[model samples]
Target: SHMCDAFVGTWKLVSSENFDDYMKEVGVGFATRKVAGMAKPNMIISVNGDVITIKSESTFKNTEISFILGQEFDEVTADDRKVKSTITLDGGVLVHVQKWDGKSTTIKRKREDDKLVVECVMKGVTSTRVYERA
Candidate 1:
């Protein structure tokens, strides 16, 4: 039942749904969204005490963030949006939030059975992605 223990590993994207719609709400251009939609990113996560690091690697680019729970840090999204980001452990889920220009998005990651499940929400649109252990 440890919160971060289950997430400390590499996970490769296996499937996704409604990701393009969610990216649209985040103000990504259509061309970029289309490109991003086809890219499958691999996530590398590590945890040490209250600090955690998450890295996303894709075909075109990579993004990384490291921070302690409850602390805010600057984050540049894959779409190139600079925002304030925070990660918190809510029960067994890692809840990540990013805010910019008075808009915000929420991403939740959890280990579901044998897979890592990620849900991203922007505005009212939600996207779900499943990842397998790598």
Candidate 2:
């Protein structure tokens, strides 16, 4: 069904659930994590063929990242550490792998109803972040 095709567009954060504990597990301080928990991050997704670019822009900070589907690319962490990554599809679910790092990260995105649900897992911590069409 070429699920990747459906991911090509801008999306806004509708709601994020279960991220506060995830952030805390990732070593984020209590105060900052609380602020992050309350923040509504605006996400924009752009796709060109196999290449995908994602931007999470918010009042606290803005993060921009790009990668190619089925090919490994460098994924820079929030602390600016680079790790190899590749995004692939398992059926209609999109899965991302940030490899070779002690704290490897995985992300899965799937469509539900009219919204897209994104689930992130890192260092044994898991969180679900949701997005809606804009």
Candidate 3:
């Protein structure tokens, strides 16, 4: 299937759940997690050929990562705490490699119902975060 142009536009964070736990697992501190959990993140996705560039913007921070449809590249998070070697596919599922402080990790993302679900694994910690369209 061809990529969806609808995904090119900006998407606001209308709702988020379990974000705190997800952040905690990522090693975010209590103060940072508190603010991050309540932040309304904005995501803008742009596509060119098999490459997709995603920019996640928020009041607390902003991050941009680019990846090929089926190929992998190191994706650095907004916080700069982790680097995810990532690949994106149709329907929003993302296969990611998580590098934490030099250690290798893995993560995945998929669309379920009206939400975007992200699962992350690092060391012995794992967490899931869900976000809905704005």
lDDT, residue 99, model 1: 97
lDDT digits (tens) for residues 20-50 of candidate 1: 8899888899889988898888999998777
Give the worst 10-residue stretch by lDDT in candidate 1: 1-10
* Tens digits of per-residue lDDT for model 2, 1-134: 34477776777787876787777665568777766677677778777666678887877667887876688877665534577888887888889887654666788988888888999886777899889988
Put down candidate 3 lDDT per residue, 89-110, tens digits, no spaces.
5445566676557666566766
Give lDDT: candidate 3, residue 75: 63
Q: Between candidates 1 and 3, which one is better according to TM-score?
A: 1
Rate residue 4 of model 3 by lDDT: 42
Instruction: Itemize residue pairs with steric clashes in candidate 1.
Output: none
- What is the number of backbone collisions in each predicted candidate, taken in the order shown? 0, 0, 0
Cα-based lDDT at residue 50, candidate 3: 71
CA lDDT of each prediction against the hidden true structure: 0.91, 0.76, 0.66
All predictions: root-mean-square deviation over Cα?
Answer: 1.4, 2.5, 3.3
Evaluated against the true structure, the overall lDDT of model 2 is 0.76
